[PDB]
Amino acid sequence: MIPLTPLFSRYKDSYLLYSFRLIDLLRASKSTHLTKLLSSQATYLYHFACQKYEVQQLIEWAINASPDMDLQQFRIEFMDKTTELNLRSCQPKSFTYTFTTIWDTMAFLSLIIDDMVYTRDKSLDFVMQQLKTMKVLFYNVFFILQCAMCRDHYMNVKGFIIYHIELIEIALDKEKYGTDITFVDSYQQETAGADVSNNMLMKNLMAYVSMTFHNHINDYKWIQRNKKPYERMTWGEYKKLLNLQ
Amino acid sequence: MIPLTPLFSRYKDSYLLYSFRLIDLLRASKSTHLTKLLSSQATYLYHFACQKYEVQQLIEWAINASPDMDLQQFRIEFMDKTTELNLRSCQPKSFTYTFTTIWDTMAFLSLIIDDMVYTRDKSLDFVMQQLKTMKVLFYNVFFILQCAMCRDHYMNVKGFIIYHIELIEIALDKEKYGTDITFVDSYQQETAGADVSNNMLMKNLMAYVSMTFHNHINDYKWIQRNKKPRMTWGEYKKLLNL
Ligand SMILES: Cc1cc2nc3c(=O)[nH]c(=O)nc-3n(C[C@H](O)[C@H](O)[C@H](O)COP(=O)(O)OP(=O)(O)OC[C@H]3O[C@@H](n4cnc5c(N)ncnc54)[C@H](O)[C@@H]3O)c2cc1C
Ligand SMILES: Cc1cc2nc3c(=O)[nH]c(=O)nc-3n(C[C@H](O)[C@H](O)[C@H](O)COP(=O)(O)OP(=O)(O)OC[C@H]3O[C@@H](n4cnc5c(N)ncnc54)[C@H](O)[C@@H]3O)c2cc1C
């Protein structure tokens, strides 16, 4: 499992805040299509929180919650409902919602993907069905906060993340057909390999993808705001921060 | 600019065929939104082929061409309209439309990007606006042929390409601010470099990206088809003289 770290503790909390604000939309959904999308997203999101039937109850309760409540009201009723459904574990400890709330949620999901691929068993079908759900979650990241330019940017470049999930998928698919997964420690080793029958995969790939992608957005926003850009996050510091080995 | 090789000639020809089939959609478009999008991709596409006013006439002609012509008929009048607008250059020499037609278009566009950044002049605003247009183009590739699964997949992973276009923009943005672009022979030195004062960018980045991506889709399709099972950068550079 994932190394219990201060940073990973925030991630898990922003992840619950994220899931909470997501089901809050359900009341106000103005399309059957978005209602379906929200409820699967939330169901999936809780499906990775470290009982499905109590979660169905929570989701169904959110669908029917009054559209005339404000968010603080929804919050209080949410707290009772998770209390009543023995889902106190879903209750966020902090409700201040920001960009970091989203970054953490994405980082948390990435760590769970690496962990699944680490702790797999030759259940290989299982992890490949999980990864497909992961693709659906990353494809449909809601901002909830307003940042129209963040939404347009993310819909341009989110294939970067989803591309690396498909790599893992291709790696596991090979391990089904006989070539085992060789784990390497650098992204350069991994890409150098796929430029040939090898099956090399970078250890903690998605964490690295997560970190790189976060750095990419922050580099680019200096183009967007038009200014001259000062301490970027690096894979080394990140592994230390998360006790990734 | 681009090494004239046999393979590049086919890319050029598929590029036109792709452009031809796209403007044929305009007459049948079922929304203002698709109409605006098609006519803009078309205008952009011709803008990268080697006058703008005569391309506007062509596209305006496509917009009003009768929705009741079949496509063979549309081809006849396109061949006349281009002949009349001195756009014989935009005439495809082959109309056999296939996945390869699409691959070649994407490959062609990638080569244009790599070429503009190579033949740049420290006109940095010019190429930085051309790349934005390139982003819209890769975001909006129509399959035209019918492959629902293909549209779904490409809509999923297309940001992989677009991401590397942004890298180039981050690269030319740094070169405008005093750190020069250091060109580099491998993807690996590029990615390792950003993980640290530096402005390294791999030579023929988009050709490599185009080739890796093409490989990715074909690897992944043995998952989708549920079956048991490749072009390499070295062979690719030889075939194109990069
Ligand atoms: C999907 C998404 C898309 C976005 N698109 C845009 C956009 O297009 N234009 C725009 O102006 N803003 C965009 N943003 C917001 C932007 O990326 C920053 O969050 C914003 O600039 C706020 O600045 P910050 O430094 O306070 O946040 P951040 O720099 O993101 O810091 C938040 C936390 O994350 C940690 N962190 C910082 N960098 C990294 C890193 N590389 N890797 C891992 N952890 C890191 C830090 O510990 C910090 O605690 C986007 C955010 C998200 C989640
Ligand atoms: C954006 C896009 C998305 C697609 N998504 C799917 C999908 O999801 N599922 C599916 O089943 N099919 C998909 N396809 C079609 C698929 O990739 C192939 O074109 C199709 O399977 C036919 O295979 P082929 O071997 O005959 O042609 P291809 O393998 O596509 O090759 C056609 C030509 O391109 C050259 N070529 C081959 N590989 C490369 C490479 N790595 N780099 C550069 N040139 C190369 C070859 O010289 C060949 O002549 C997609 C195509 C495109 C353009």
Swiss-Prot record, chain A:
Functional description taken from the UniProt entry: Functional FAD-linked sulfhydryl oxidase that is required for infectious budded virion (BV) production and for the formation of enveloped occluded virion (ODV).
Enzyme class: oxidoreductase
Recorded GO MF terms: thiol oxidase activity
Family to which this protein belongs: Belongs to the baculoviridae p33 family.
Superkingdom of the source species: Viruses
Quaternary structure and partners: Homodimer.
Entry keyword annotation includes Oxidoreductase: yes
Compartments reported by the entry: Host cytoplasm; Host nucleus
Keywords, alphabetical: Early protein, Host cytoplasm, Host nucleus, Oxidoreductase
Protein's name according to its UniProt entry: FAD-linked sulfhydryl oxidase
The enzyme's E.C. designation: 1.8.3.2
